[PDB]
Design a protein around this nucleic acid. Structure first.
Ligand code: MG
Ligand code: ZN
Lengths: 41, 311, 230, 345
DNA sequence: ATGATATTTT
DNA sequence: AAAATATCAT
């Protein structure tokens, strides 16, 4: 791709190297599990 | 299924036919008709042994018109085997074609330019080539002929003086015969092509054989951070027709909902009336027929267990 | 594309295609050599099941109404399965919805009013006391039927006007709101308004009434089409 | 609230609380802290000391003394002196204090600039209307006899755990839960609070509860249908916002103190569904007849009477008898409870 | 002056 | 989990 760009031709490919790879004790006891955690709204 | 894919396919077919032999067309066409072909399947399709397919695959890989992908397979009742698949990587194939075409044109242009230069000289005995500038410092004391340093023999003029028109004709023929490639490249550059991989190529897959041993799938190892060179790339509608019976039913349900809402916000009994003295807490059918008969008389008078989820 | 793709049926590779032009829509898979061909009509199919996306292997199983019949298809690429699965879900749900619905199942001139025999019968059937008097005064009494309506013109005219008047034109389609699954309600008056205001829908409807498919399926297709949007 | 209603950015906001001692490094900004951290004099950690020194270092332009009804306390008065601010503003809803220290505010912060009528705002629709009530719960004979002999400090636990009161609390919660109304049951007595909660299978909050758990219960109770009612303690009496709560009960309460009564009532005066037509929030006060609780309750609602609220006496709760299940219905259950409560002291 | 309850720190 | 200091009411 670099050589093609230098020559003035638009390259259809790119260099692969440029690619990117990607608490305290709870006192409330008896009712610890029934309730779900509504952290946000 | 954009036309760009067809244009690229035409470019590959023309390039292979014009710049490669016959068996090359067979191999590349098969992987163009079928997005991905296993090595075993390709051999069966073209009925060519491994040795014959060797040069074809190797040469096409060198020019990058084809790409290879090796993955381990685990057949249910056979030893694990490393399978080979071939598929076309369009961005690389187009780039390789573009550069190669430019080099060929440039090489011919350089050859044409060089031919116009003065011929030169060469020694008949030792076959050593002397340039015009280099030979001008070798002429004998008599200023008659150029003498070779190694052989001490008169030099002989070089050929290719009359080939000036021949190179121009060669360049003209190439450009005339290469016009489709230039036109196809221009169209390709106008649009954009997404990079192709083995997984993507499998989408446009047409199975070659009924019971091909190779599994045309892709199941990368879970949580595998290993990276290999050249292995990465950049509602339903429900309709309910409402009739008179349904319309009144909907009205009744709406009335019931309103009644429930009203009762919800009503004040309790103890908040309405002062509670002091209360104990402390601690036939017509026949008529219709005769009418119908009578009216009828009138008108006459006037006239395998696996994990699954619901979907 | 969505219509066609690669799949393996009964441990045999082949091409799986969806045909919606022919009613009812059917799914046909043919082997590479063509010696093996299988066709399943989506009308019979009832429930569709797919393997979880987490699982490496990809398959789709269709079970129809009755030892229930089952049809299992295996795909190579996950993207093709999603497109095929989505299209199958739309048709399966649409056909199921149709089955659910099926399981549920001048003129005002005084002279013309007297001459309008059909109107007289309709009024007499609706009213009881008037019918009772008419029977007494025209069956046994023998009084001419025509003379009876001479003195009851205003009542006859009012009855006629109770069904000879129509609401004014309005943007019927703008009132329809779909309100994933969404329920949109229609009424017979609503259907008539759509036909009157938009002749194209009437032309599309008249062709498909008994022939292409049952009426309910038409509206489901129409509201999901680009013609409705336009 | 500050973030939701102004243009300030996090760069200028820092909270000097127990959870985190983050301090703002910007040229200027908002610093929100608590009275205990600032007022503490003897023992404060070095990490907190540096932030406290930062607070005392720069001169401030404005200081807001939220809940200014506790400033006249013995030690909280030091906050005004330590922090140097030109303008100091106090904001409170109940300017009431049992001792004669309430008047001291006039020379610690400033004069009472403005006041608003509770009734006036209720008509305008800004604070939800509340129909206060004071349920009279008679004490049964077996329970009452033990009340007379016991000493004063032990006296409190006899009437707070009155079986008749327990039935009244259960009936009111059940009746108002049917109407889809969130109910908050305050109880100053921790032991009674836990006993009621465990029997009713409902949550509770008080000092032992950690900050994370307390916040989780508050957020959950606001946005979950199943958890319609939660008990509380003295921690939640003042300075907490929760629009969902509409009803409210108090099985037990601190000694006669108008501040807590008004603050607890205010917990349900900001209900979001206050503008809906024909809506009335509820405020229930369960007391035991012939006990000292009656004396305190009358003295504990004086402030509400002055502001305009009127208390209605409910001698009989209609529909209680038909309830299929009532706690401590059998005499044996009452005797077992009496022994259990007596074993406490 | 004492007892509850709450909060902060180590 | 145990200490220590405030606060609110008798
Ligand atoms: Mg506040
Ligand atoms: Zn030589």
């Amino acid at each position: 791709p670099r050589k093609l760009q230098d020559l003035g031709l638009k390259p259809a490919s790119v260099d692969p190297a440029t690619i990117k790879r990607q608490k305290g004790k709870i006192t409330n006891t008896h009712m610890t599990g029934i309730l779900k955690d509504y952290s946000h709204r | 299924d954009r036309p760009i894919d067809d244009i690229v396919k035409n470019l590959l077919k023309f390039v292979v036919r014009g710049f490669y032999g016959g068996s090359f067309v067979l191999v590349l066409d098969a992987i163009l008709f079928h997005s991905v072909l296993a090595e075993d399947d390709l051999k069966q399709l073209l009925s060519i042994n491994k040795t014959e397919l060797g040069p074809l695959i190797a040469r096409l890989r060198s020019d990058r018109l084809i790409s290879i992908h090796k993955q381990r397979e685990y057949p249910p009742n056979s030893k694990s085997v490393e399978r080979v698949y071939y598929y076309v990587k369009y961005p690389h194939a187009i780039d390789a074609i573009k550069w190669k075409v430019h080099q060929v044109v440039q090489r011919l242009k350089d050859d044409l330019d060089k031919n116009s230069e003065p011929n030169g000289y060469m020694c008949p005995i030792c076959l050593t080539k002397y340039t015009q500038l280099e030979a001008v410092q070798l002429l004998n004391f008599d200023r008659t002929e150029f003498l070779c340093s190694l052989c001490d023999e008169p030099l002989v003029e070089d050929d290719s003086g009359k080939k000036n028109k021949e190179k121009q004709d060669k360049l003209n023929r190439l450009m005339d015969q290469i016009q489709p490639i230039i036109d196809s490249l221009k169209k390709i550059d106008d649009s954009r092509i997404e990079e192709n991989t083995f997984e993507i190529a499998l989408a446009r897959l047409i199975p070659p054989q009924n019971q091909s041993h190779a599994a045309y799938t892709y199941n990368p190892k879970k949580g595998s951070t290993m990276f290999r060179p050249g292995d990465s790339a950049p509602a339903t509608l429900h309709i309910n027709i409402t009739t008179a019976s349904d319309e009144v039913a909907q009205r009744e349900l709406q009335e019931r909902q309103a009644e429930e809402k009203r009762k919800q916000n009503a004040v309790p009994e103890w908040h309405k009336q002062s509670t002091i003295g209360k104990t402390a807490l601690g036939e017509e059918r026949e008529n219709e027929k005769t009418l119908n008969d009578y009216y009828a008389a009138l008108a006459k008078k006037q006239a395998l267990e696996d994990e699954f989820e619901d979907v | 594309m969505s219509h066609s793709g690669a799949a393996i049926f009964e441990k045999v590779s082949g091409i799986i295609a969806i045909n919606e032009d022919v009613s009812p829509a059917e799914l046909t898979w043919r082997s590479t050599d063509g010696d093996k061909v299988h066709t399943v009509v989506l009308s019979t199919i009832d429930k569709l099941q797919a393997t979880p996306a987490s699982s490496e292997k990809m398959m789709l199983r269709l079970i129809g109404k009755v030892k229930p019949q089952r049809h299992m298809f295996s795909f190579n690429n996950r993207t093709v399965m999603d497109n095929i699965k989505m299209t199958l879900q739309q048709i399966i749900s649409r056909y199921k919805d149709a089955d659910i619905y099926e399981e549920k199942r001048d003129s005002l001139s005084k002279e013309k009013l007297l001459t309008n025999l059909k109107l007289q019968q309709s009024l007499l059937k609706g009213n009881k006391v008037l019918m009772k008097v008419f029977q007494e005064t025209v069956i046994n009494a023998g009084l001419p039927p025509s003379e009876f309506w001479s003195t009851r013109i205003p009542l006859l005219r009012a009855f006629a006007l109770s069904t000879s008047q129509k609401v004014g034109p309005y943007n019927v389609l703008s009132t329809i709101k779909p309100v994933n699954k969404v329920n949109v309600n229609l009424s017979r008056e609503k259907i008539l308004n759509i036909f009157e205001n938009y002749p194209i829908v009437k032309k599309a409807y008249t062709d498909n009434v008994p022939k292409n498919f049952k009426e309910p399926e038409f509206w489901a297709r129409f509201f999901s089409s680009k013609l409705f949007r336009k | 609230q500050f973030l939701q209603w102004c243009t300030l950015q996090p760069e200028n906001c820092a909270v000097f609380t127990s959870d985190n001692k983050e301090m703002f490094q910007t040229e200027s900004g908002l610093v929100v802290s608590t009275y205990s951290m600032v007022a503490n004099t003897r023992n404060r950690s070095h990490d907190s000391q540096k932030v406290m020194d930062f607070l005392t270092g720069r001169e401030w332009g404005f200081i807001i003394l939220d809940e200014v009804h506790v400033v006249p306390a013995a030690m909280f008065r030091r906050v005004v002196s330590t922090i140097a601010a030109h303008a100091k503003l106090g904001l409170t809803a109940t300017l009431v204090r049992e001792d004669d220290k309430i008047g001291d505010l006039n020379f610690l912060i400033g004069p009472k600039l403005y006041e608003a009528n509770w009734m006036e705002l209720s008509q305008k629709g800004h604070i939800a209307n509340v129909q206060c009530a004071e349920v009279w719960c008679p004490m049964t004979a077996e329970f009452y006899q033990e009340y007379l002999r016991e000493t004063a400090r032990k006296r409190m636990l006899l009437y707070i755990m009155n079986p008749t009161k327990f039935q009244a609390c259960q009936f009111l919660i059940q009746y108002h839960e049917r109407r889809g109304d969130k109910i908050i049951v305050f109880s100053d007595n921790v032991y009674a609070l836990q006993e009621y909660a465990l029997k009713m299978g409902k949550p509770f909050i008080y000092g032992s509860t950690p900050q994370q758990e307390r916040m989780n219960i508050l957020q959950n109770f606001q946005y979950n249908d199943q958890i319609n009612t939660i008990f509380l303690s003295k921690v939640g009496d003042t300075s907490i916002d929760l629009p969902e709560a509409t009803c409210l009960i108090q099985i037990s309460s601190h000694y006669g103190s108008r501040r807590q009564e008004a603050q607890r009532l205010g917990r349900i005066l900001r209900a979001k569904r206050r503008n809906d037509e024909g809506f009335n929030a509820f405020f229930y006060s369960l007391v035991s007849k012939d006990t000292q609780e009656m004396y305190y309750s009358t003295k504990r609602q004086a402030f509400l009477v002055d502001q305009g609220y009127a208390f209605k006496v409910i001698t009989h709760l209609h529909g209680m008898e038909n309830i299929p299940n009532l706690a401590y219905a059998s005499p044996r259950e009452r005797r077992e409870l009496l022994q259990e409560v007596l074993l406490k002291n």
